[PDB]
Design a protein around this ligand. Structure first.
Ligand SMILES: CCCCCCCCCCCCC/C=C/[C@H](O)[C@H](N)CO
Lengths: 57, 242, 283, 120, 245, 108
């Protein structure tokens, strides 16, 4: 196979990289992943606020 | 050997090329990763957070620049006057240059989707009033009276326990994507004008101050996208560093 | 169990979203109790009001992709990091690696606090007017602690374990690939503190903000011959960024840079981040 | 061994700029600091300022701020001191020294000692 | 029913009646370092009753022409309590925090404060004004203690970055007509699982008056601001003799 | 600024006799940042004493000192006089670090 040494190894990206050498960091970039988590920056709040209910009642 | 041919496109360095290049260290293994909080997978997550909008960008505030972040609301003598007006173009220079949405739009060319503007009232508890916040699609100039400006999308905001309102700027365009507006020919891509009017007065009792301030915040909706990455003119390197 | 006291939550997971959100049809709504337009920005949470809770909408099925704003596509573009010139005069230079001397790539990398990636460097070499001549060159990467060369004919150029590249000027540019080589788990562009111990005096003020985990040694070039070469050299280095992870975004700088190592700014002309207008009512 | 090598004495008129440059070798230039001390006749030795060669960070005495500026270049192992707005009273001997590591912040190696004199 | 709150940890208790919600920065709770990410070999100590409690710093005064203040963490707690003694005898520490900022006024005052948490808040200097000085901030400025320092140019936060997009950080507001306390819970953020407590400041806390304080003549003119902090999951490792600073 | 008063100004003694050179500081300062320097005539200065009790390599061990607070003294009581020089005490606890007044000796 090859020795797995890339900076993205724990949480990795899509499986389309091309490599000709033995070292995995020399590979191509490949197409990136579509995952995102928009909630942990726009709602970092303990008690859940809905859309219909008034937030400070 | 294997017979081969070389086409046009040989020995050129295209900077945006994605390919395999020869490694300099055999058998190297990096440091294992740990869990650091706050990972960003996409730039569209930072574009939904709300940042302050500099509506009060006058030419007299350039020496005391902290005044630009709030615009005043006072007790009027006439009815239906306007408080402020500003364009809704995030790519054009103006009030949107102070946001993280207007600074990350400078790195791309075309944008799509709808925005949102949030106002927050910073007066006293005893003060009341109502405002009218209207968004006008392109085609005209700034309206002359309140009876003309309300024919578009608007919302009526009452100052109370909840000290915030949100006006959504809906996506009304002929084209699917919209490049950055400018003077000249590129104001075919304008998106309109946001004004704010006095519905009723700003009523205050005796013993409370007669001038309040409003902070305006801006963000993006969930259908906001961008494409065609370029560079910004918001940085300039006229001299060498150090 | 003789002691009952010694025996004695994630918020949101991420999901795959290839395209932007759709729009569902809406109609008018008159009622009490339910109000989605009044928010509270004092809680530090952004508003959650969509289009349909404010206006009446139609059904819209948009297939706008979100691929372009991934951080792998934002960074995979080679930018200039150094310009090295051999007029210095003895046929060799030593350039200590500091990739923040040019403001265009610096403003992009300083959007995040921590970053962890693989690099890819390209070396473009010519005379100071662009004219190319046949001339042999050697670049050598010196890791921190190794002896650096002091002359064109030193013993350090024997490159028994230091990686070196030989190239002549009439080639395509040379390209290499570098791993993630830090002792820590990420690079950090902002380090609040002093690296050393001891009582801090005025002499210790010159050390503030220097992280030792980001120093990667020097980078040495020379002409491979042993006598004086009659040509001048000008080298340009470009760097791509692959396999990126980034953490904790920051504000973007609005003042022009002054030095390579600190956020000092020119305090006389504080540039306003917006362009000013005359009156607030007339745009 | 480690020795500090300075420049020769330079004669200029009052109201002009002059350069003085001392160069060191025999040790790694980036690890240690560099100080500049001025010794005038009839007075004690006076500290101008110290400088880190790694980043170009500087420091100046409050009586000498505006009088002289310090800078460095990393590759050629040289640290030079620019002298602006010279008067006749600046005619003294200037020493460049480095700070010690195991010592409790002590200058241990000094230069040859360059000299400036100011007259018309 | 959501306006009232009570936080109890250790032997201390904070009660409030005009509160917003609680903010957990980046959706992560503070916790101990697992054995997958740990690198040091010796066993860490966990006092967790004497160090995980609410500590109250000094009190500032909001004038009508104030600029702002900033505090550094964990610089503020290196001289008080059992936390200040464990940090002097050990070499490595790791902890989360919990910041609570009180400022109350009447129903006839007005104003707004922006309380934000900025990690690796590196300061800057005005380069002598002219821009040709490679100056550096002094030791009393970069590490101000439990007193805290004031801002000189709050528009750029003394670091070249604008105040208008400080809200990308985990933050809250104190609007004087709605709430009077702000509260953020911060986990441990670093590239390393442990770090020294005397050389490195993890994050900084900025309190800046966006809308200035106003009232009428005859009302109370002394409006104070108080900060209260509590370590959450503090561990220490690498015992040593006491190093003061 | 912090003033160092180095007393006396002149000295002349015989071989084998004690030589006491006193520095008086206006503020009570940290004793471990005080240093002593030796200037051969027409030559660069040389460090003698760091930490107020310890010596560098190349120096005979006859030189010593003991001082705290305001007063600070260094003592040599030996026979040889091949080293005639000016002596300076240099404090470094407070910024800017300043030298002493200056003391030079003469032999018989
Ligand atoms: C023949 C190969 C020579 C090329 C070797 C280059 C290896 C160095 C790559 C380091 C990647 C960036 C690491 C640190 C960047 C900045 O210089 C520092 N943070 C300075 O702040």
């Amino acid at each position: 196979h090859e020795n797995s040494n890339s900076a993205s190894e724990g949480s990795t990206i899509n499986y389309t990289t091309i490599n000709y050498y033995k070292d995995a960091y020399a590979a191509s970039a490949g197409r990136q992943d579509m995952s995102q988590d928009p909630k942990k920056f726009t709602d970092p709040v303990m008690d859940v606020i809905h859309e219909m209910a008034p937030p400070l009642k | 050997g294997i017979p081969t041919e070389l086409k046009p496109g040989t020995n050129q360095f295209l900077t945006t090329d994605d390919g395999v290049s020869a490694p300099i260290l055999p058998g190297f293994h990096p440091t294992p990763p740990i869990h650091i909080p706050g990972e960003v997978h996409n730039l569209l997550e930072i574009c939904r957070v709300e940042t302050i909008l500099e509506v009060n960008n006058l030419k007299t505030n350039e020496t005391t620049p902290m005044q630009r972040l709030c615009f005043p609301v006072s007790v009027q003598s006439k009815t239906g006057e306007l408080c402020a007006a500003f364009r809704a173009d995030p790519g054009r220079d103006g009030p949107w240059q102070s946001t993280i949405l207007g600074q990350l739009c400078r790195y791309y060319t075309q944008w799509s989707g709808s925005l949102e503007v949030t106002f927050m009232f910073a007066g006293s508890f005893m003060a009341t009033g109502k405002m009218l916040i209207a968004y006008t699609p392109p085609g005209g100039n700034v309206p002359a009276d309140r009876i003309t400006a309300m024919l578009g999308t608007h919302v009526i905001w009452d100052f109370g326990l909840q000290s915030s309102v949100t006006l959504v700027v809906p996506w009304i365009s002929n084209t699917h994507y919209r490049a950055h507006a400018r003077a000249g020919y590129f104001d075919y891509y304008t998106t309109g004008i946001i004004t704010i009017w006095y519905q009723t007065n700003y009523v205050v009792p005796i013993g409370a101050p007669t001038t309040a301030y409003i902070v305006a915040l801006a963000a993006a909706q969930d259908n906001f996208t961008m494409k065609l990455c370029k560079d910004t003119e918001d940085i300039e390197q006229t001299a060498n560093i150090q | 169990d003789p002691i009952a006291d010694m025996i004695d939550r994630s918020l949101t997971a991420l999901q795959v979203l290839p395209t932007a959100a759709n729009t569902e049809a809406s109609s008018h709504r008159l009622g009490t109790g339910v109000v989605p337009a009044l928010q509270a920005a004092e809680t530090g949470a952004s508003s959650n009001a969509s289009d349909k809770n404010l206006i009446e909408t139609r059904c819209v099925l948009n297939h706008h992709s979100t691929q372009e704003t991934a951080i792998g596509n934002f960074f995979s573009r080679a930018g200039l990091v150094s310009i090295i010139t051999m007029p210095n005069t003895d046929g060799y230079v030593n350039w200590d690696i500091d990739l923040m001397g040019y403001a265009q790539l610096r403003r992009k990398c300083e959007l995040f606090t921590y970053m962890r990636f693989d690099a890819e460097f390209t070396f473009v070499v010519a005379k100071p007017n662009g004219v190319l001549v046949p001339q042999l060159l050697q670049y050598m990467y010196v890791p921190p602690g190794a002896p650096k060369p002091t002359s064109r004919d030193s013993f350090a150029w024997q490159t028994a374990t230091n990686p070196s590249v030989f190239v002549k000027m009439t080639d395509p540019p040379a390209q290499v690939s570098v791993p993630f080589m830090s002792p820590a788990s990420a690079y950090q562009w902002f380090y609040d503190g002093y690296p050393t111990f001891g009582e801090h005096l005025q002499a210790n003020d010159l050390d503030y903000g220097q992280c030792p985990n980001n120093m990667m040694g020097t980078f040495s070039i020379r002409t491979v011959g042993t006598e004086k070469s009659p040509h001048s050299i000008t080298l340009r280095v470009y760097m791509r960024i692959k396999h990126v992870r980034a953490w904790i975004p920051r504000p973007l700088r609005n003042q022009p840079y002054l030095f390579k190592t600190n956020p000092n700014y020119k305090g006389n002309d504080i540039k306003c981040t917006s362009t000013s207008r005359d009156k607030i009512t007339t745009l | 061994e480690v020795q500090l090598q300075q420049s020769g004495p330079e004669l200029v008129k009052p109201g002009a700029s002059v350069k003085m440059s001392c160069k060191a070798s025999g040790y790694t230039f980036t690890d240690y600091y560099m100080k500049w001390v001025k010794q005038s006749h009839g007075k004690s030795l006076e500290w101008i300022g110290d400088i880190n060669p790694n980043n170009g960070a500087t420091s100046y005495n409050q009586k000498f701020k505006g009088k002289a500026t310090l800078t460095v270049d990393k590759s050629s192992s040289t640290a030079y001191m620019q002298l602006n707005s010279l008067t006749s009273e600046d005619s003294a001997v200037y020493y460049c020294a480095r700070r010690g590591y195991g010592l409790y912040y002590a200058m241990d190696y000094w230069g040859q000692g360059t000299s400036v004199t100011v007259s018309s | 029913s959501d306006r009232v709150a009570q936080l109890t940890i250790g032997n201390s208790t904070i009660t409030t009646q005009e509160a917003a919600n609680i903010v957990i920065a980046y959706g992560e709770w503070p916790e101990y370092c697992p054995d997958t990410d740990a690198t040091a070999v010796d066993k860490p100590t966990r006092p967790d009753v004497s160090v995980n409690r609410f500590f109250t710093l000094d009190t500032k005064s909001w004038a009508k022409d104030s600029k702002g203040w900033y505090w550094k963490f964990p610089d503020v707690l290196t001289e008080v309590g059992v936390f200040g003694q464990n940090a002097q005898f050990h070499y490595l520490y790791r902890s989360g925090f919990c910041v609570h900022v009180q400022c109350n006024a009447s129903k006839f005052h007005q104003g707004a404060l922006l309380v934000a948490v900025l990690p690796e808040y590196v300061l800057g200097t005005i380069a002598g004004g002219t821009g040709n000085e490679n100056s550096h901030p002094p030791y009393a400025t970069t590490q101000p203690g439990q007193v805290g320092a004031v801002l000189t140019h709050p528009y750029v936060l003394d670091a070249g970055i604008p105040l208008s997009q400080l809200t990308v950080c985990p933050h809250q507001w104190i609007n004087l007509r709605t709430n009077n306390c702000a509260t953020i819970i911060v986990p441990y953020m670093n590239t390393v699982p442990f770090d020294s407590a005397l050389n490195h400041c993890n994050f900084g806390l900025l309190v800046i008056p966006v809308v200035p304080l106003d009232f009428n003549a005859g009302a109370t003119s002394e409006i104070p601001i108080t900060v209260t902090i509590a370590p959450m999951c503090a561990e220490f490792a690498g015992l040593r003799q006491a190093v003061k600073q | 600024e912090i003033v160092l008063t180095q007393s006396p100004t002149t000295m002349a003694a015989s071989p084998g006799e004690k030589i006491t050179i006193t520095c008086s500081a206006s503020s009570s300062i940290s004793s471990n940042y005080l240093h002593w320097y030796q200037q051969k005539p027409g030559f660069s200065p040389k460090l003698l004493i760091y930490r107020t009790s310890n010596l560098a390599s190349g120096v005979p061990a006859r030189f010593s000192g003991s001082g705290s607070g305001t007063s600070y003294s260094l003592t040599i009581g030996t026979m040889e006089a091949e080293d005639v020089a000016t002596y300076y005490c240099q404090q470094g606890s407070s910024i800017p670090h300043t030298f002493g007044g200056g003391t030079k000796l003469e032999i018989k």
